[PDB]
Amino acid sequence: MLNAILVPVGILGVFGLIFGIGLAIAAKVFEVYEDPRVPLVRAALPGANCGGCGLPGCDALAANIVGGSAAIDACPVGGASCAAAVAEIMGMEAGSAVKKVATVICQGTCETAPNRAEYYGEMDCREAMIASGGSKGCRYGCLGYGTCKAVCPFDAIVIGEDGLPKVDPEKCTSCGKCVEACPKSIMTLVPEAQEVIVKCHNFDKGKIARLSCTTACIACGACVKACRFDAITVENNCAKIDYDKCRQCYECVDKCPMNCISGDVEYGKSTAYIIEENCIACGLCAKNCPVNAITGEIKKPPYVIDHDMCIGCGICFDKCRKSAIEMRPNKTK
Amino acid sequence: MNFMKNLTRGIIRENPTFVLVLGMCPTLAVTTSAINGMGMGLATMLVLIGSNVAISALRKVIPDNIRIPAFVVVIASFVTIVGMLMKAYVPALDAALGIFIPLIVVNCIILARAEAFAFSNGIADSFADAVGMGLGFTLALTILGSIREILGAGSIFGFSLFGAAYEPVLLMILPPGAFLTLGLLIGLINWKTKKA
Amino acid sequence: MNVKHGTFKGGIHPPYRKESTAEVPLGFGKKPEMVIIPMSLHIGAPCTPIVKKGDTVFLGQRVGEPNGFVSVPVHASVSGKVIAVEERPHASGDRVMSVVIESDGLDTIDPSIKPYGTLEDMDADAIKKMVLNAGIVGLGGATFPTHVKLAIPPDKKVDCVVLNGAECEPYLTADHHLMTSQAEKVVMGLKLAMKSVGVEKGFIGVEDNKTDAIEALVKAIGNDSRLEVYSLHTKYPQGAEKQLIAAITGREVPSGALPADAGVVVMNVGTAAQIAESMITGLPLYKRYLTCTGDAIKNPQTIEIRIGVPFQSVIDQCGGFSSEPGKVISGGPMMGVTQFVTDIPVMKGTSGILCLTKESAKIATPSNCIHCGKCVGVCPIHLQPLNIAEYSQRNMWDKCESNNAMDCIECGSCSYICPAKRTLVSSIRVAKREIIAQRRKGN
Amino acid sequence: METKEKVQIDWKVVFKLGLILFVISAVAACALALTNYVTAGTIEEMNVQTNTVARQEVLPKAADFEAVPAKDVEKIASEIGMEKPEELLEVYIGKSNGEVVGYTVKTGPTSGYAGEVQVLTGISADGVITGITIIKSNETPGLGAKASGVWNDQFTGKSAKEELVVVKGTTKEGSNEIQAITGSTITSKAVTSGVNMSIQVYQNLSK
Amino acid sequence: MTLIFIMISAIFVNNFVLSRFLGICPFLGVSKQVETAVGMGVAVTFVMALASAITYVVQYAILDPLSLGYLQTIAFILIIAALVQLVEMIIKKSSPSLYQALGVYLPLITTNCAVLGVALINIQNEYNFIETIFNGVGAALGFTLAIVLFAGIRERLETSAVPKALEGFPIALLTAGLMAIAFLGFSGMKL
Amino acid sequence: MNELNLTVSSSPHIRAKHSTASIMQNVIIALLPALAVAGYVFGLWALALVAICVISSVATEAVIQKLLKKPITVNDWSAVVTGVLLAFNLPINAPWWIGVVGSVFAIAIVKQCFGGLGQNFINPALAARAFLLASWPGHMTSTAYIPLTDTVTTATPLALLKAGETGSMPSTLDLFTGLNGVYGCIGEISALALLIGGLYLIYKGIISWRIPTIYLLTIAIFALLVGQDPIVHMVSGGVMLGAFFMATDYASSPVTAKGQIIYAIGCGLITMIIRLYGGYPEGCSYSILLMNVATPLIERFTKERIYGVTKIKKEAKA
Ligand SMILES: Cc1cc2nc3c(=O)[nH]c(=O)nc-3n(C[C@H](O)[C@H](O)[C@H](O)COP(=O)(O)O)c2cc1C
Ligand SMILES: Cc1cc2nc3c(=O)[nH]c(=O)nc-3n(C[C@H](O)[C@H](O)[C@H](O)CO)c2cc1C
Ligand code: SF4
Ligand code: SF4
Ligand code: SF4
Ligand code: SF4
Ligand code: SF4
Ligand code: SF4
Numbered sequence A: 001m002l003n004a005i006l007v008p009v010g011i012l013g014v015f016g017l018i019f020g021i022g023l024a025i026a027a028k029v030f031e032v033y034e035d036p037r038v039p040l041v042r043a044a045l046p047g048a049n050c051g052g053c054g055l056p057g058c059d060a061l062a063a064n065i066v067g068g069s070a071a072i073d074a075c076p077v078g079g080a081s082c083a084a085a086v087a088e089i090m091g092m093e094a095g096s097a098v099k100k101v102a103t104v105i106c107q108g109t110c111e112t113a114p115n116r117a118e119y120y121g122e123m124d125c126r127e128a129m130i131a132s133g134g135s136k137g138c139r140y141g142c143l144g145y146g147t148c149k150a151v152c153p154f155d156a157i158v159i160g161e162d163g164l165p166k167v168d169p170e171k172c173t174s175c176g177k178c179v180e181a182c183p184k185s186i187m188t189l190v191p192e193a194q195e196v197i198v199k200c201h202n203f204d205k206g207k208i209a210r211l212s213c214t215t216a217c218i219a220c221g222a223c224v225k226a227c228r229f230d231a232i233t234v235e236n237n238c239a240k241i242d243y244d245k246c247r248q249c250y251e252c253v254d255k256c257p258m259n260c261i262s263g264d265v266e267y268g269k270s271t272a273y274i275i276e277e278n279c280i281a282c283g284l285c286a287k288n289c290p291v292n293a294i295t296g297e298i299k300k301p302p303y304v305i306d307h308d309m310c311i312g313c314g315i316c317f318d319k320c321r322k323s324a325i326e327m328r329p330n331k332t333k
Numbered sequence B: 001m002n003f004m005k006n007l008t009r010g011i012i013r014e015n016p017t018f019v020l021v022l023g024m025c026p027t028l029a030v031t032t033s034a035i036n037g038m039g040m041g042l043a044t045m046l047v048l049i050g051s052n053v054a055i056s057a058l059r060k061v062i063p064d065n066i067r068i069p070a071f072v073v074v075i076a077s078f079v080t081i082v083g084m085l086m087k088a089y090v091p092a093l094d095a096a097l098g099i100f101i102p103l104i105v106v107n108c109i110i111l112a113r114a115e116a117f118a119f120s121n122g123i124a125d126s127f128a129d130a131v132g133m134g135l136g137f138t139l140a141l142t143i144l145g146s147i148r149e150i151l152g153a154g155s156i157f158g159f160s161l162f163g164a165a166y167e168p169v170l171l172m173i174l175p176p177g178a179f180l181t182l183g184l185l186i187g188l189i190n191w192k193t194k195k196a
Numbered sequence C: 001m002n003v004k005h006g007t008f009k010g011g012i013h014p015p016y017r018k019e020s021t022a023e024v025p026l027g028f029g030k031k032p033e034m035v036i037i038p039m040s041l042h043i044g045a046p047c048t049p050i051v052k053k054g055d056t057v058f059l060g061q062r063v064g065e066p067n068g069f070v071s072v073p074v075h076a077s078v079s080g081k082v083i084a085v086e087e088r089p090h091a092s093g094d095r096v097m098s099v100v101i102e103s104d105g106l107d108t109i110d111p112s113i114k115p116y117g118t119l120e121d122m123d124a125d126a127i128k129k130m131v132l133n134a135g136i137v138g139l140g141g142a143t144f145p146t147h148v149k150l151a152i153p154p155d156k157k158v159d160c161v162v163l164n165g166a167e168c169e170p171y172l173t174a175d176h177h178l179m180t181s182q183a184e185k186v187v188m189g190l191k192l193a194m195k196s197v198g199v200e201k202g203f204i205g206v207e208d209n210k211t212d213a214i215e216a217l218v219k220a221i222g223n224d225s226r227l228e229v230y231s232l233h234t235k236y237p238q239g240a241e242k243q244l245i246a247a248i249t250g251r252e253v254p255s256g257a258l259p260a261d262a263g264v265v266v267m268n269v270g271t272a273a274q275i276a277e278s279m280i281t282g283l284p285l286y287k288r289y290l291t292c293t294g295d296a297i298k299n300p301q302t303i304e305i306r307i308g309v310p311f312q313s314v315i316d317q318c319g320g321f322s323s324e325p326g327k328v329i330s331g332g333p334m335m336g337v338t339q340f341v342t343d344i345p346v347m348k349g350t351s352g353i354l355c356l357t358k359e360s361a362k363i364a365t366p367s368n369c370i371h372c373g374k375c376v377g378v379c380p381i382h383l384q385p386l387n388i389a390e391y392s393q394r395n396m397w398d399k400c401e402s403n404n405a406m407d408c409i410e411c412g413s414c415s416y417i418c419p420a421k422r423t424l425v426s427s428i429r430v431a432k433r434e435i436i437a438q439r440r441k442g443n
Numbered sequence D: 001m002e003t004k005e006k007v008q009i010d011w012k013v014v015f016k017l018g019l020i021l022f023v024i025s026a027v028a029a030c031a032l033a034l035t036n037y038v039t040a041g042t043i044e045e046m047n048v049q050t051n052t053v054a055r056q057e058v059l060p061k062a063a064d065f066e067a068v069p070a071k072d073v074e075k076i077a078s079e080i081g082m083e084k085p086e087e088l089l090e091v092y093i094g095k096s097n098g099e100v101v102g103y104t105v106k107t108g109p110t111s112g113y114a115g116e117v118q119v120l121t122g123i124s125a126d127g128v129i130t131g132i133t134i135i136k137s138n139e140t141p142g143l144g145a146k147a148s149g150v151w152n153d154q155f156t157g158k159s160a161k162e163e164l165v166v167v168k169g170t171t172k173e174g175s176n177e178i179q180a181i182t183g184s185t186i187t188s189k190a191v192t193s194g195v196n197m198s199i200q201v202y203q204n205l206s207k
Numbered sequence E: 001m002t003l004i005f006i007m008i009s010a011i012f013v014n015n016f017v018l019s020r021f022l023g024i025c026p027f028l029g030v031s032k033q034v035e036t037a038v039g040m041g042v043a044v045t046f047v048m049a050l051a052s053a054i055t056y057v058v059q060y061a062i063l064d065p066l067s068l069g070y071l072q073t074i075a076f077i078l079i080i081a082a083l084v085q086l087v088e089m090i091i092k093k094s095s096p097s098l099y100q101a102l103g104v105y106l107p108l109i110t111t112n113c114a115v116l117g118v119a120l121i122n123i124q125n126e127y128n129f130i131e132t133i134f135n136g137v138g139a140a141l142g143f144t145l146a147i148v149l150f151a152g153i154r155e156r157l158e159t160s161a162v163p164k165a166l167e168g169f170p171i172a173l174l175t176a177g178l179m180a181i182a183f184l185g186f187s188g189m190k191l
Numbered sequence F: 001m002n003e004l005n006l007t008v009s010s011s012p013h014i015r016a017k018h019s020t021a022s023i024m025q026n027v028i029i030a031l032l033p034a035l036a037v038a039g040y041v042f043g044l045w046a047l048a049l050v051a052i053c054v055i056s057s058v059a060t061e062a063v064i065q066k067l068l069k070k071p072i073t074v075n076d077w078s079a080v081v082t083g084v085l086l087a088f089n090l091p092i093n094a095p096w097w098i099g100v101v102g103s104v105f106a107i108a109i110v111k112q113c114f115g116g117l118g119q120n121f122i123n124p125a126l127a128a129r130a131f132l133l134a135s136w137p138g139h140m141t142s143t144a145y146i147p148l149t150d151t152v153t154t155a156t157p158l159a160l161l162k163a164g165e166t167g168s169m170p171s172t173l174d175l176f177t178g179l180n181g182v183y184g185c186i187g188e189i190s191a192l193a194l195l196i197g198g199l200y201l202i203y204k205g206i207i208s209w210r211i212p213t214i215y216l217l218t219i220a221i222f223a224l225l226v227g228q229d230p231i232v233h234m235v236s237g238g239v240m241l242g243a244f245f246m247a248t249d250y251a252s253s254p255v256t257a258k259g260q261i262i263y264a265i266g267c268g269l270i271t272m273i274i275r276l277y278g279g280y281p282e283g284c285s286y287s288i289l290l291m292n293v294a295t296p297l298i299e300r301f302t303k304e305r306i307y308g309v310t311k312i313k314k315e316a317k318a
């Protein structure tokens, strides 16, 4: 019984023992690829280990980055948090400026902007652009064949029964794959908190645009006089709104004679809704902020003020030293 | 909480045969009957449980340079013990699965699970993971074997169904009769995953 | 004479319905009463108007000034007064700035037009200056400026000039009439171009279905031993500036290097006739030939018509519509552009007006590919259109570029022979546009 | 010079790398041999039991068996002109109260579809085949594995005077005719060749 | 003459992938392109050719005249794993690093059922040294031919339009079944 | 105030006259005389089988094209061609369900699972035959071909040649015309009628001379190098049907002119390798099926040279 245990143990032990020394020696001479410092990104990655990203090895995020040969968001499994962590190892990311969605600046739907002729070919926007630019009356409007839907990877665009695309705000993640795929340069990126957008891209004069479409821009310039914060400009016979200076006063919406500016009149009208706790009866708002809308006597707490005037810009919400005024949107509907 | 999730990942969510597509040689080789698949699944389950527990017990002393030689020794020892017991007590199953019983050591799902979930977790999670993977393997093998046997022999579990004059489709018990069938099954699952 | 032969590999055989207007005599248009002249009658930089509303203009007076180097001036076709300097519909589908002139009835020539000279007295610099001053562009269809073409860079060498008389598109017979009637002007223009470039070799290539034109050219050449005439086999893509080079000279233009790297200069017979006429008379380019034909035209014919006349005036002068048209095409049936309206004026590169009836303009819907392989057989560049089209249809631009999609000449042939009635050339155009566009936003 | 003089301690970890592996390997052996000590002999017993059954079912009676010393078997293989050697495995003699009973011959014939099959044949005193059986085969389960079924039962009754001929037809004609399986013909010929070799051995021995 | 017949039967009549169901996981995993298929075939050929001789020597020099026949599998897999470790070490360093796109199938060259399968087949068939070498090379060449043909077919399939639900693995399995029929044409040949 | 409403599209504005349906109708017209000979020789049951197959094929396609929400393009006459060519590959003693099963396998699995018409890489009518022969070998081998009224034949001409009994074989003129005791598949016995209709497709431009000529030349050379009769090996078996009608499939053949020469040489070599040293009396089907797999590999080495691209050598990416 002694030999039957001694011989196999000895043979297998010798075989195992020589191979360990052989592999330890083979660690040298052969592969010495340690020269990229590995322990950079091996914990922020959730871990899938699949060959659908490049990166020959899921721990290869140590030589793929320091040369700019790989994209920051090359890992879809890791997502925004993992990409932000990887970038903030070097910096750049972990920033600000909220989130954006995709919008269509056009509102002509197969009945207000009809077709000049009939088009034969493939049902695609670029294929239609081959056939002399399309068969629509307006040379700047939506063709309606849905290239942007075909290029969207997250399934956020659906083509409505009226011909214009609709974007789901919960499935769209702030990319531009549908922006450079539009032949008409119509798809654009807009902040999710914005509700006042000029929806037209027509660069013709008044009479031709009036003949072409029902809700066209005629470059009358009446929307610039109403605005006082210098946020909307008329250039190339078309109006455009700057979103960095727009206070959403809803003043230009009612003045457009052709209904090109989006939004409904439900806004503001809250002149000095002041919380009684943290105001010292300063009375600095009684004098003037460009409209009067406050006039009273000292205004000891609680404030006695009638609310039937003012435009609701929002400057009086941050210029106070204590910020005792509260902004609440309360109107009809 | 953390024990039931590991056990129930298993069959439905991460099926080795239908969702990971691993261990395709025994699946296409032995599933000509409803009995061979169950025995192969049970043997693979025992080997997987033993190897996972043994590897997870020693995840502190094995360096990263001699890892695979250290793993294959344990896997081969368990496979050899199971094969000796099966040859001692169940000769018919050993004869029906002659070449693939020594080949359980290289099954594409034992080493992968050992690398993934055994060298980084505890002892209690690996046991549940092995049980779930073995159950999924056994169920998939049984389903494929029954589907092939009904068409290619006209009987289920040795019990005839279509009479004594039935002429079977003798391609389903051939090497080309496996691939196609499995492919169709996978397609069906994908459809019922993506339209729901 | 030594009339040699030549041909190329690939091509198709369309019906060639030219017999309708070939035996009909040549007609001359009437005096117009209103002309619209666009500011972009070439390729390059558009001109700038130098006239105002209410002004009085002469015949041959310049109304537009070139901007850069690749730009030609624009002249007036009639004598009258200016009524509008606004923008009007164009043949490209969008409105283009133009000048509208109302005719007076008399054709008063500007009091500064005199003959330039003689062939022996002009030499190369004055020839090029005269070509630039008369506003001559390419009448073959591309409308590339001629004075740019005759200015060879110092790092290139050329040794021959080839005239393209192989008019190959169906329904079109203007070059046949021009070669039969005005062969002497063609020979004089060829000699002028040869002297301007500075070579001692010249070739003329005419297809074999114009034997009377070949006889007229042979008689007009005379005893000059430096000029030759080639009789070419009748095929569709024969005249596309590249197969002509292969058939006549035997050389091949490199992969994206222009014919000037092959040592040749290719011109048209109409351009040569215009050069000779402008040298003899001194008048600019204001008139050319057209072929009004089709299925919905009562009396098709070839007519000489000034520049700026609308399409509807030509159609009315050629009888009118026998039935309701379903398609109006500016050019030939194989490379023409379909129109939206009939207010379009004729241009310097308009070679015909083709009107099709409703029954003859119907094409079935595209179907699945059956892998017949005829499109591979008919391609003159030896490409494989099916693979390029299938890769372009699912947005794979790298595979389209790797399959050599940027050297297609867009000749139509591959889309003409398809049993499944597909749109291969349109997909190839889409792929080419995307590949070109991606080089500017990534570099 | 060992790639610019690796610094000493590179060897010190080497003794750490081997030893653990050594230990693991030893433990593996320390298991396996023990299992063998419990298992192997038992397996052998099972094998011989099956062989005993294989010897008893073919010649059904109450009798004893004796084994040829396996040098007479090689002498018989050398004689009679058996063109391929080592295809005859075991020859046994039955005994029932002194008088001779018959013989039981095991042979592995080649030229099958998937290698070598094993055929056992039993013959009585007067020439009559009392049954054949298949011991080992490696053919298709649905095409060539049907020889160990109802196809064997037709082999009983054939006299041990002449050889056998396989015919491809539903009709069985007359004497010494064997009907093959539909879609399986090479296996039938291999089994018939093994039976012919066994019957030649019986004819040579029983005289 | 016998060696040529052995090689021919190994490559055509008894192909490892389509008939014996051995090299299937890398077959589906790596055959998306031709160059990777060729590289994997070359690596597999090297591994099999080097492993066969060592397994033969170990079996017939040590295990047989010691009555230790139950230690075949563990010793064979130890030798194969030690070889594949060196193969992994040499491939990534000097051969291109972009070739590490196999993604798990490179340490599955250790698994690679055809390798241990052909080792056990050579052992069980009672061959010689040169017969084992020829059998290993023939099996490797058959694997390479099958994977190259599959990688060639899959690009023509990427040209076509599978509807929406088959796509990757079902259409690969159906293609493999059709190729298995076409190679079932190669049957019944006595060599 | 009359508008025009013209049509706008891209070039060209004219097309040819031929379409997809005309090609398949011409194929049926070419296949008609073989059907006439089969009906004359084998009787009224030889026609009905064909009809059954055709019906099944069409029905299957329609059902699938209804379930996947696709246009029903059954009027291109492709399933009719598939059904007729499948029915020509059957013996006279086959049950009625064999054709139905074969048609369902050929249409549903081989063709419609890869996309549809022109999107498969393998021959449907030969793959279905190979599946039927392997699944039910008793209904398709050596006895179903002989009619029940003839009791003195017992063997088809290709089975009397592999056994050396070339003295009881039919004459060479009878193997060519197809009369006076020649048995086999119903649509293969006459080589005179498969050549008359095969020369009609060459004249109309549907197929070329390359594959039919090089398939038949290699068989004659191989039979000459080993000391046999070149003519008996060409007028017997399914060689004339496979050379003109089945190896010239559009979706399985190379598109260039240099690949169609290499493809035919392999098709002719693998046939005579299986015929002489194999386990089948005939190996045309598997020789054709094995060259449908290597077709994507021939096509990447036999491309032509693009105009203007002469380069210097094959440096490529080096
Ligand atoms: C498909 C195709 C066909 C053409 N056919 C003619 C033709 O028949 N006659 C012609 O003068 N130019 C033809 N061209 C234009 C020539 O390629 C070339 O641009 C022309 O000879 C230049 O003439 P120019 O120097 O007077 O501008 C064709 C071009 C293409 C792409
Ligand atoms: C010249 C020609 C040959 C054909 N040969 C076959 C054939 O051998 N088998 C078949 O099933 N279909 C055949 N077809 C028709 C078939 O529907 C098609 O060619 C594709 O193979 C379908 O994918 C043929 C069609 C043509 C035009
Ligand atoms: S997606 Fe991210 S986690 Fe998955 S393999 Fe790629 S890099 Fe690794
Ligand atoms: S938004 Fe642009 S891409 Fe989308 S359908 Fe309209 S035109 Fe096409
Ligand atoms: S392509 Fe990107 S940005 Fe556009 S809709 Fe889809 S997810 Fe939003
Ligand atoms: S005028 Fe403005 S709104 Fe109307 S179709 Fe044109 S771009 Fe759209
Ligand atoms: S008011 Fe309306 S129509 Fe006028 S310029 Fe502004 S957006 Fe255009
Ligand atoms: S909403 Fe107010 S701030 Fe914005 S553009 Fe209109 S007027 Fe100006």
Ligand code: SF4
Pocket (backbone or CB within 6 Å): A274, A279, A280, A281, A282, A283, A284, A285, A286, A320, A321, A322, A323, A324, A325
């Ligand atoms: S602190 Fe603000 S709310 Fe109070 S009086 Fe001054 S401006 Fe008005």
Ligand code: SF4
Pocket (backbone or CB within 6 Å): A271, A272, A289, A290, A291, A293, A310, A311, A312, A313, A314, A315, A316, A317
């Ligand atoms: S919203 Fe503007 S205008 Fe109105 S009270 Fe506040 S600061 Fe004054």
Ligand code: SF4
Pocket (backbone or CB within 6 Å): C368, C369, C370, C371, C372, C373, C374, C375, C376, C385, C386, C417, C418, C419, C420, C422
């Ligand atoms: S001609 Fe049309 S149908 Fe034929 S191969 Fe080319 S694209 Fe396909």
Ligand code: SF4
Pocket (backbone or CB within 6 Å): C378, C379, C380, C381, C383, C385, C408, C409, C410, C411, C412, C413, C414, C415, C425, C428
């Ligand atoms: S259009 Fe382009 S691809 Fe088509 S035949 Fe002409 S050159 Fe070839």
Ligand code: FES
Pocket (backbone or CB within 6 Å): B022, B023, B024, B025, B026, B106, B107, B108, E022, E023, E024, E025, E026, E111, E112, E113
């Ligand atoms: S190769 Fe994966 S289990 Fe065999």
Ligand code: NA
Pocket (backbone or CB within 6 Å): B064, B067, B068
């Ligand atoms: Na490792």
Ligand code: NA
Pocket (backbone or CB within 6 Å): B025, B026, B100, B103, B104, B106, B107, E113
């Ligand atoms: Na296995």
Ligand code: NA
Pocket (backbone or CB within 6 Å): B020, B021, B022, E025, E028, E029
């Ligand atoms: Na896999």
